[PDB]
Backbone as ProteinMPNN parsed JSONL, in Angstrom:
{"seq_chain_A": "GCGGLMAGCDGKSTFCCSGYNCSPTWKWCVYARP", "coords_chain_A": {"N_chain_A": [[104.299, 65.09, 205.299], [101.993, 65.159, 207.234], [98.86, 65.22, 208.499], [96.562, 67.712, 209.044], [94.207, 69.853, 209.331], [93.093, 69.551, 206.876], [93.92, 66.857, 205.58], [94.25, 63.935, 203.992], [91.834, 61.491, 203.36], [91.512, 59.48, 201.73], [92.787, 56.999, 201.666], [91.341, 55.691, 203.754], [92.308, 54.775, 206.242], [94.151, 56.625, 207.29], [96.761, 58.313, 209.321], [97.098, 60.966, 210.065], [98.599, 63.982, 211.544], [99.085, 64.833, 214.329], [97.153, 64.384, 217.035], [94.32, 64.444, 215.57], [91.358, 63.454, 213.852], [90.198, 61.441, 211.297], [87.864, 62.332, 208.858], [85.092, 60.87, 207.224], [83.116, 61.745, 205.788], [84.224, 64.317, 204.9], [86.825, 63.619, 203.716], [89.333, 64.025, 204.997], [91.681, 64.532, 207.291], [90.835, 66.017, 210.486], [89.706, 67.915, 213.639], [90.098, 65.662, 216.797], [88.342, 64.137, 218.509], [88.401, 62.381, 221.252]], "CA_chain_A": [[103.126, 64.243, 205.367], [101.16, 65.443, 208.328], [97.555, 65.567, 208.12], [96.251, 68.633, 210.016], [92.481, 69.893, 209.432], [92.742, 69.256, 205.732], [94.908, 65.854, 205.118], [93.715, 63.212, 202.837], [91.284, 60.314, 204.157], [91.197, 58.43, 200.617], [93.272, 55.775, 202.122], [90.306, 55.123, 204.611], [93.371, 54.495, 207.406], [95.511, 57.483, 207.331], [97.097, 58.62, 210.948], [97.234, 62.531, 210.35], [99.852, 64.274, 211.98], [98.954, 64.583, 215.884], [95.722, 65.181, 217.759], [93.593, 64.804, 214.298], [90.579, 62.322, 213.537], [90.051, 61.332, 210.013], [86.396, 62.199, 208.597], [84.534, 60.152, 205.854], [82.51, 62.814, 204.903], [85.209, 65.319, 204.387], [87.944, 62.914, 203.384], [90.553, 64.588, 205.295], [92.007, 64.78, 209.048], [90.166, 67.263, 211.17], [90.167, 67.711, 215.045], [89.752, 64.604, 216.926], [86.952, 64.262, 219.912], [88.534, 61.12, 222.108]], "C_chain_A": [[102.557, 64.371, 206.755], [100.03, 65.943, 208.052], [97.133, 66.359, 209.329], [94.503, 68.674, 210.084], [92.207, 69.649, 207.812], [93.512, 68.097, 204.89], [94.063, 65.152, 204.31], [93.199, 61.404, 203.474], [91.231, 59.429, 202.902], [91.972, 57.194, 201.054], [92.423, 54.817, 202.999], [91.273, 54.59, 206.031], [94.351, 55.283, 207.631], [95.502, 57.856, 209.144], [97.224, 60.145, 211.066], [98.384, 62.564, 210.715], [99.818, 64.138, 213.552], [97.933, 65.404, 216.404], [94.676, 65.547, 216.205], [92.764, 63.537, 213.997], [90.417, 62.471, 212.019], [88.244, 61.428, 209.749], [86.152, 61.584, 207.303], [83.836, 60.912, 205.193], [82.951, 64.009, 204.068], [86.176, 64.663, 203.569], [89.141, 63.514, 203.833], [90.391, 64.555, 206.8], [91.298, 65.839, 209.547], [90.396, 67.105, 212.656], [89.408, 66.217, 215.568], [88.642, 64.817, 218.335], [86.805, 62.611, 220.894], [87.735, 61.224, 223.291]], "O_chain_A": [[102.79, 63.383, 207.451], [99.957, 67.002, 207.427], [97.259, 65.902, 210.465], [93.744, 67.881, 210.642], [91.022, 69.554, 207.494], [93.74, 68.275, 203.694], [93.077, 65.749, 203.88], [93.918, 60.482, 203.858], [90.749, 58.341, 203.218], [91.489, 56.187, 200.537], [92.582, 53.599, 203.077], [90.64, 53.927, 206.853], [95.4, 54.861, 208.118], [94.584, 57.716, 209.952], [97.459, 60.594, 212.188], [99.225, 61.692, 210.498], [100.564, 63.288, 214.039], [97.779, 66.623, 216.325], [94.379, 66.689, 215.855], [93.419, 62.502, 213.876], [90.502, 63.594, 211.522], [87.464, 60.7, 210.362], [86.927, 61.753, 206.362], [83.86, 60.837, 203.964], [82.451, 64.535, 203.074], [86.389, 65.274, 202.522], [90.066, 63.535, 203.021], [89.331, 64.55, 207.426], [91.19, 66.75, 208.725], [91.203, 66.25, 213.019], [88.445, 65.707, 214.996], [88.421, 65.887, 218.901], [85.807, 61.944, 221.164], [87.715, 60.301, 224.105]]}, "name": "protein", "num_of_chains": 1, "seq": "GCGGLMAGCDGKSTFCCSGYNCSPTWKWCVYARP"}
């Protein structure tokens, strides 16, 4: 259950795996830009 670059953002509050931000337009975790 680790969201990398194509996880699931349907919950609107997922935590991906490590170092991945969720995208609302793509509906999956992607690279984070902190």
